[PDB]
Every structure is written in structure tokens, then in C-alpha cells.
Design a protein around this ligand. Structure first.
Ligand SMILES: *[C@@H]1O[C@H](CO)[C@@H](O)[C@H](O)[C@H]1NC(C)=O
Ligand SMILES: *[C@@H]1O[C@H](CO)[C@@H](O)[C@H](O)[C@H]1NC(C)=O
Ligand SMILES: *[C@@H]1O[C@H](CO)[C@@H](O)[C@H](O)[C@H]1NC(C)=O
Ligand SMILES: *[C@@H]1O[C@H](CO)[C@@H](O)[C@H](O)[C@H]1NC(C)=O
Lengths: 416, 419
């Protein structure tokens, strides 16, 4: 009963470090589902005139390989579930009326507009995982695969934007436009496309991005069809995480310098302050000049006897160091800008970006590649020519692979 | 309240994953300290004729300030204790050799490796602990993640490979070559590196398995009361046993990973999965036909949802796949023996290694660089000649550095004789 509390309270400090040892919990999952049959196609056709079965196996992968998620949300245009189980209260369907701030955009018919407003679902945990109904987990995946406290959120990158793009691509042009925006805002940098995977997102960082970039997100959500200059959901979040700048708070610098927590620096702490300010090697002249500028600032600005080197040195405090312009400028010049969030970068180590080209000889090869080498993230986008004699056979073998991977029943299905 | 209990078990699976998501806790700290007292000097003089910096008090402050999540601190010493130490504090325990060595004939150990090889056998010790050599201290902020991670196992720190040149070395390279030859005879030959001198995370189970796998060498190194070429080092042996331990393959594990249905019988899909796991791409119909031929032959030589492409196939259960010699041989050839313990390797990114050569400007530069760029682990080797007139100056400089880095008295000390 009290053993759980006492175990984390049993250290030399007597504190509790659950926020640093047990990861952030709980974690939710957000999917997306669209049905291209009958009414939706009719709406698209009339809009043009005026102007498969992957989700089940994805949820089965959620049950099998990632059993640490709390809730599953599926965003729909009002399409009621066809095989989901609503008796279990751990899965719910959220209509776009909730995510949209304005009801005039409910005929979405576009993916970035849906993806931009995910973080406004009520009941969502602090961090949530986003899957686009063509990805799944093929190996045991744990939250430390996405986020570790010491090295921050984990970012997976892939081919660079200019190299992997091509002319005449609607999606490539949007990524280039987002690149232009971020290079004109945070400065020029080499950018790499995030991997197509079940990304992990944080509500706080995304909301900060919303507040920082309201007009552009509103503009890209305004479009009713996928446009050439939309903003990607994963790339924006990840690169804002990378390039988030934090102001240099001098008070924390002094707090870390002043180990006594007494607010006054002894003769030994000026050594640490000067060495953090200065660059190697360090001569006595620089330290004497630091002491001289300190006394000059104390004398020019009107204002337990610790012994110092120079008796002309008055005791130094926060009210002195923070209001001393030369030392603050020297600290700012010395201390580089530090990122507000931490991150770790890797590549395509365990990501199965498999492409279906409507050639069963190659489809079976790709599936065998997946089967021999199990991977944590699998991408199986359904690209079929549908005008080929053996096109149904590709779907048949793909569904055979799906059945092979996850044949066990899941509780999120009606026992028909 | 029900919410407090359900918070850790609120999930789809309904199971508590605390043993995996909450890191290995608790963790203890062990120290090896010795003092140059009159009795120790007299016993050393007697042994040879027959045949202090007080860095502990500052490492304790470093543990208190930078590593507040440790549980207990154990120190092993030759019966002597500092006067300032707070023995009345029920969180630091002095440990004598009467409960460390298996035999009482080595109590005049007088050699660090003998104590090191047995430091893991103290009663009440946590399954994982951090080894402190009384000269290394912490910095920045240290968490169990800096030593161990569940997804990647432990983290081993390697500085630079052993030279193997020979024709030199007094008492350090010889022990490295000794352990190197032992591990070459046991696990094979490879280019090995010397672990960094730093606080090391040690497992009691792995250490016990190491001691039960090389028992003769370890009672030999416990035999030597003076450090010699014939001793087996602590960090080198532990880390390379962890990095080179292997386990024989168990057919049940692969049989269960290929049995996605968890039914005990393999359909065509599972047979294809096994075939593509064991064989190389591009898999063709010939390999599957040969596998089915081998299956039917091994069946002839001796429960719902049943369907097969070939009617000759009996239900492929654990019995039929476990006892088939040639396909088990091909399975072993495909999936070799892997390491039993996970590990992670990295270099010299965040380790501080400083030496004092009595050249005052360079030791001052070293400590100034430590101050400028704090690092997680600091190692200050003291080998001052003590005949240079600046020995007291170096002592004062090191005292100044230690006091500046940790001026606050620790919970393990009695504040006495102020200033
Ligand atoms: C700087 O850190 C101090 C620490 O005492 C804190 O009180 C203060 O709010 C911080 N300032 C800013 C602008 O964040
Ligand atoms: C599939 O690719 C192979 C590559 O060797 C080619 O020979 C074959 O014609 C392709 N099949 C189809 C149906 O395009
Ligand atoms: C090895 O396989 C056997 C098969 O009977 C199983 O019972 C046992 O638990 C396995 N042992 C290990 C150590 O994996
Ligand atoms: C002492 O150290 C300095 C580096 O700070 C070096 O230049 C000098 O040559 C060294 N030796 C002597 C004898 O001064």
C-alpha cells in the first residue's frame, strides 16, 4: 500500500523522482480513416464539377506489439465504424466538428487540414501517437523508442528534401514551401524529411507552434483539397522541436555558479564564473579585469565578512550581476544560444518503407524481407494499378501477409 | 483511492509495465578507501622486510548533490573509519572483510583487486550498484539512464585499445594481457579496449556468473596479497564477459516467434515465414518444395482451422520440428549464437581524465578546463612526487577546487572544528 510511495521516497535526498524514472504516462493513439465509396466520391465529383482493410490490422498491431497505449481515437468525416467495438470504452470516434475551430470547414476533403488540428481533442494525454492507417508495429515498441528524458524526444530522419524530390510533385512542392518558410524564419539550414512512421507528438510543443504560426496553419487548413503549399504534420513539429530557441536566463547561470545558495559569490566562485565566461587558456589579467569592471559597475551605480583578494571588491549579488551590463554582454557573447528542447537523430535503422509496385514477384520479395527481418515500424501503402490482370492477386498476397502477421482475434472487433 | 491503483494499470492490456518502464531501482554506491595510518605503514614494512587528500568526503558531497537517487552507500576499508564520518547516519555502512572474502586467510589483502573481486558479495546489496574508487566524482546530473537502458542494455565506456606491443609495462599492462589471453582462450581473439576509469554499474548476477565461469583465476587473484601480473582485473573482465557472453539457441523461442497464431500448428503462411527466415533471398518455389519434402520424410520416418496445400503434411507441432536433425542444423547455421546480455558502446565524449605532474600551470589549466566545461565523471589521478616544494601548493589548489565544487557539508559528515 505505502511500499510503492516509500520505494521512490527511499533515497538519500528523501524526494520522489517519478517524473524522471518512469517516463510520461499515459499515451494515446490517434488514427485517421476515410472511406472512398459512394457518397464521398459523389461529393468529390460534384465539387470538381462546381469548381484496403488496413485499419483492422493496424489496431491488431496496437494490441499485440504496443500494449502500453491508453486510448485510440479515429477522426472521421462522420463515417460510423464498420467493424469497431464500441462496448469497450477504450476506443472512441471523434468527428471533425470537435477538432475544427470553425464549423465552416467541416467538408474537409484534405489530409493536412485534418492533421493540423489533432491536438484539440478533449481527453487526450500530454503526448499522443499519430498513425495514417497504412503503418503498424512489427516488433515490440516501447515509449523509450520515441522519447527518452535524457536525450529528449527521438526524431527519425530520412532522405533530404532536394535530393528525394522531383518536379511536378504536389507533395514535394509543399515540403519545399515549408522549407522556404522555416529557412526564412529560423535561418538557412540543411533539412531532412522525417520518416513515414507512427510519430509521437506533444500537445504543448504543437500548441506553441500554433501560437507562433497561427496565420499559416489557418491558411493551410482553409484549403478544401490537398494544395501545392500545405504544411506537413510531422516535418513542422519535428523541425520546430529541433530549432526551438530558449532565452538566456542569467539568473539560472548565477544560481548554478553560486553553489552556496547564499546569493553572494566568494573568491573561488568568481573563478568558475570567469572560466565559463572566458575561453581557454585563462590568464590572471582577464580575471583582474573582470574584478575591475565589477568594482567600476558597483561604484558608478549607487547601491560574515567573507575575505576576498582585492579589498576594494564589494560583495556581488543578483542585484549587482544582473544589472551589470558589461558582464551580461560578455556572458551573452560567450554562451551560445541553447535549444529549448532536446532530441536524438538516427536514420532508417528499423523502418520498413516498402513500396508496392503491382508486381507480385517483387511484392512477395518485399514481404519476405519484412518477415526475415522483423522491424519496429512497417509502411505498406496500398498502391495498385487496378488496371492489371493480376492486380487482385497483389491484394490477395498482401492480405495473406496481413493474416500471417496478426491472426489472433482482438477485443476491438464484434464476434460475428 | 481506486484512481491511484488504476493509474499504473490503466491500459489496453490491463497489465502493469512498471518493471520495464521505471528503470532498474534501487541502486547503491560502493567505495574502496584506504588510509596511510601508522598501523598500515607498519604492516607494509613488516611484509616487505619478511618477503591524505580526503577525496572521500568530497565524493560523498558529489553523490549527495548530483546523484540523489541512490539508496545506500557502502564503503569497504581495513577496519578503519574517518573520525568526521557520520556512522550514526543509518544510510552509510562500513564493511569489513569478514563478510566479503570467502576465506579468512586473505584478510591482509593489501591489494585492490582482491577487494574488488569480492565487493559484490556484501549482504543487502542491490542487484545493480555503482563502483566508486575513492578518487572519481560525479558532475552535471547523473541518472540510471547514463549507465543502463532497457532497450539497449548497459552502456560500456571504452577509451583506447590495448597496444599488445609488449616489451614493457610494470604492473598495469601485464594484467591486461593476462585477462586478454584468458578471454582469447575462452571466447576467441579480437581487438579489445581498456574500460574507462569511472563509476561503473555492476550486476550481481553477471558478476556471480563470471566468478562461477572462471573460478580458478579468481581465487588466484584473491590469493595475491600484492598486485602482480597474475591477477584478473575487475572492469575488464566484467565488461568483456558481458559483451562476449553467448547462449545456445532454444528451438521453443524461434518456434513461438514463427507461430503467430499461438496454436502450436503451422499453416502455409507460418511455413513460408520460417522458410524465408532460414533461407536467403530470392526465395523460390524450389526451396519450399524441398522443405515440404523434408517435412514429409521426417514425418514418415517415425485442433481446428486445418488447411494445407499438400495433403501429405501432418500437423507440424513442436515435436515434429524439434527432432528433425537437418533442418535444425540449417536453422543453427542461419541464426548463429548471439550475445545473451545487451550492451551499448561509446567513447570519450563525457569523461574527464586529468593527471598532476607538479607543473603548477598545467594542473591549474586542467582544473580551469574542468570548471569551464563540467563533465559527468571526473577522474583526478594524484601522483605528486611530494619532494617538490610546490607539493603543498598543488595540495592547496586541489583543496580549493574540491571546496569550490562542493562547499556544502554532506549528510554523512559531522561538522566539527569549523575552519
Ligand atoms: C530565471 O531563473 C530564475 C531562477 O530563480 C527564475 O526565478 C526566473 O523566473 C527565470 N527567469 C525567466 C525570465 O524565465
Ligand atoms: C516484375 O519484375 C521483374 C523483374 O525481373 C520483371 O521481369 C517482370 O516482368 C515484372 N512483372 C510484371 C508483371 O511487371
Ligand atoms: C527452452 O525450451 C524449452 C522447451 O521445452 C522450454 O520449456 C524452456 O523454458 C526453454 N528454456 C529457456 C532458458 O529458454
Ligand atoms: C609548466 O607548464 C607550462 C604550461 O602551462 C609549460 O609551458 C612549462 O614549460 C612547464 N614547465 C616549466 C618547467 O615551467
Amino acid at each position: 500500500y505505502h511500499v510503492l510511495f516509500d520505494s521512490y521516497r527511499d533515497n538519500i535526498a528523501g524526494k520522489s523522482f517519478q517524473n524522471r524514472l518512469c517516463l510520461p504516462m499515459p499515451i494515446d493513439v490517434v488514427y485517421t480513416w476515410v472511406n472512398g465509396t459512394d457518397l464521398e466520391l459523389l461529393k468529390e465529383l460534384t465539387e470538381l464539377k462546381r469548381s484496403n482493410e488496413e485499419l483492422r490490422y493496424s489496431l491488431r498491431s496496437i494490441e499485440r506489439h504496443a500494449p502500453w497505449v491508453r486510448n485510440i481515437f479515429i477522426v472521421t468525416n462522420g463515417q460510423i465504424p464498420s467493424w469497431l467495438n464500441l462496448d469497450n470504452p477504450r476506443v472512441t470516434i471523434v468527428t471533425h466538428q470537435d477538432v475544427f475551430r470553425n464549423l465552416s470547414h467541416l467538408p474537409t476533403f484534405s489530409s493536412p487540414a485534418i492533421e493540423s488540428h489533432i491536438h484539440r481533442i478533449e481527453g487526450l494525454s500530454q503526448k499522443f501517437i499519430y498513425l495514417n492507417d497504412d503503418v503498424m508495429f512489427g516488433k515490440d515498441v516501447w515509449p523509450d523508442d520515441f522519447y527518452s528524458h535524457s536525450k529528449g524526444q527521438k526524431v527519425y530522419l530520412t532522405w533530404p528534401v532536394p535530393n528525394g524530390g522531383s518536379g511536378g510533385d504536389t507533395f514535394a512542392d509543399s515540403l519545399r514551401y515549408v522549407n522556404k518558410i522555416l529557412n526564412s524564419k529560423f535561418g538557412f539550414t540543411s533539412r531532412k524529411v522525417p520518416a513515414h512512421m507512427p510519430h509521437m507528438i506533444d500537445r504543448i510543443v504543437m500548441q506553441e507552434l500554433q501560437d507562433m504560426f497561427p496565420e499559416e496553419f489557418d491558411k493551410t487548413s482553409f484549403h478544401k483539397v490537398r494544395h501545392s503549399e500545405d504544411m506537413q504534420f510531422a516535418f513542422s513539429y519535428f523541425y520546430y522541436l529541433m530549432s526551438a530557441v530558449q532565452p538566456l536566463n542569467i539568473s539560472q547561470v548565477f544560481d548554478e555558479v553560486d553553489t552556496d545558495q547564499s546569493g553572494v559569490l566568494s573568491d573561488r566562485e568568481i573563478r568558475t564564473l570567469a572560466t565559463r565566461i572566458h575561453e581557454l587558456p585563462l590568464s590572471l589579467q582577464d580575471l583582474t579585469g573582470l574584478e575591475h569592471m565589477l568594482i567600476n559597475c558597483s561604484k558608478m551605480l549607487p547601491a560574515t565578512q567573507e575575505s576576498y583578494y582585492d579589498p576594494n571588491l564589494p560583495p556581488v549579488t543578483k542585484s549587482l550581476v544582473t544589472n551589470c551590463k558589461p558582464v551580461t554582454d560578455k556572458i551573452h557573447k560567450a554562451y551560445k544560444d541553447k535549444n529549448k528542447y532536446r532530441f536524438e537523430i538516427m536514420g532508417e535503422e528499423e523502418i520498413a518503407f516498402k513500396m508496392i509496385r503491382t508486381n507480385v514477384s517483387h511484392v512477395v520479395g518485399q514481404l519476405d524481407d519484412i518477415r526475415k527481418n522483423p522491424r519496429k515500424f512497417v509502411c505498406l501503402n496500398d498502391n495498385i494499378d487496378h488496371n492489371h490482370k493480376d492486380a487482385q492477386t497483389v491484394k490477395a498476397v498482401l492480405r495473406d501477409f496481413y493474416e500471417s502477421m496478426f491472426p489472433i482475434p482482438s477485443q476491438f472487433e464484434l464476434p460475428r
